[PDB]
């Protein structure tokens, strides 16, 4: 769980640390690292075009293009996160980082994907965006994960990046926030994860104030302690509050 704080190109310390981590993690370790480092005939990966909304696109096709772009960047399995995300930084700063992601065009993980999905949907007021955070428990350890909730034309969905295909993008077909959250919980249970906490943020402003950050935890439910009827009750109340701009 290393983060690149050195910018681009990545500095020696960060670069050598990445290689040592994967050498430890991978069973062929040194042989694998030696095959890649200083290899003379590595494919230059193509650079995917950054998606941009045009009036000729349906909103679902546009969102799918955003999600496909993220998938083309790839989920970052290297162990070194390439773009530092300070979650409490103002949005203006986070959007500079998102632009840097489109310029440097490297693999990303879940938090970077949320920032990137905000950047790529900024300026389409029909799409409301809000972070959804999960704390899960699996075989004795806690895991944190976050996706970008989407609300558009009376439907909920999500954008994101995960190691698992069922914990990221969700189509605009959920009629309530509860249904969307319960679909994530059901997906998590396929991997024997118990959801401990669900955190819902506020809508992310399309035109935020200079110092406004993302709000990540406007609603926090300790769902492992609640009956599903109460979870739905609390999510639906909060979602109604969101939709009314209270």
């Amino acid at each position: 769980f290393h983060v690149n704080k050195s910018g681009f190109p990545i500095d020696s310390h960060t670069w050598e640390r990445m290689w040592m981590h994967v050498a430890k993690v991978h069973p062929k370790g040194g042989e694998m690292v030696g095959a890649i480092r200083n290899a003379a005939f590595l494919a230059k990966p193509s650079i995917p075009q950054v998606p941009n909304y045009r009036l000729s696109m349906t909103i679902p096709d546009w969102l799918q293009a955003i999600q496909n772009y993220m998938k083309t960047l790839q989920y970052n399995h290297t162990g070194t996160q390439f773009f530092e995300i300070r979650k409490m930084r103002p949005l203006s700063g986070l959007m500079e980082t998102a632009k840097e992601m489109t310029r440097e065009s490297l693999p990303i993980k879940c938090l970077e994907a949320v920032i990137l999905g905000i950047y790529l949907t900024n300026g389409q007021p029909s799409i409301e965006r809000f972070p959804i955070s999960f704390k899960t428990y699996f075989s004795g350890n806690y895991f944190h994960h976050v996706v970008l909730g989407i609300y558009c034309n009376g439907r909920y969905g999500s954008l994101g990046m995960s190691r698992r295909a069922e914990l990221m993008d969700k189509p605009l077909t959920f009629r309530t926030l509860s249904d969307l959250i319960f679909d994530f919980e059901d997906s998590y249970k396929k991997y024997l994860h118990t959801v401990k906490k669900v955190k819902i943020g506020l809508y992310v402003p399309h035109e935020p104030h200079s110092f406004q950050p993302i709000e990540w935890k406007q609603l926090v439910l300790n769902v492992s302690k609640m009956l599903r009827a109460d979870i739905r009750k609390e999510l639906e109340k909060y979602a109604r509050d969101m939709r009314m701009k209270i």
Binding site: F1, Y75, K109, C110, L111, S133, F134, T136, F143, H144, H145, V146, M161, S162, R163, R164, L167, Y188, Y191, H193
Partner: peptide, 5 residues
């Protein structure tokens, strides 16, 4: 976040 999941 780190683990993402």
């Amino acid at each position: 976040e780190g683990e993402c999941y």
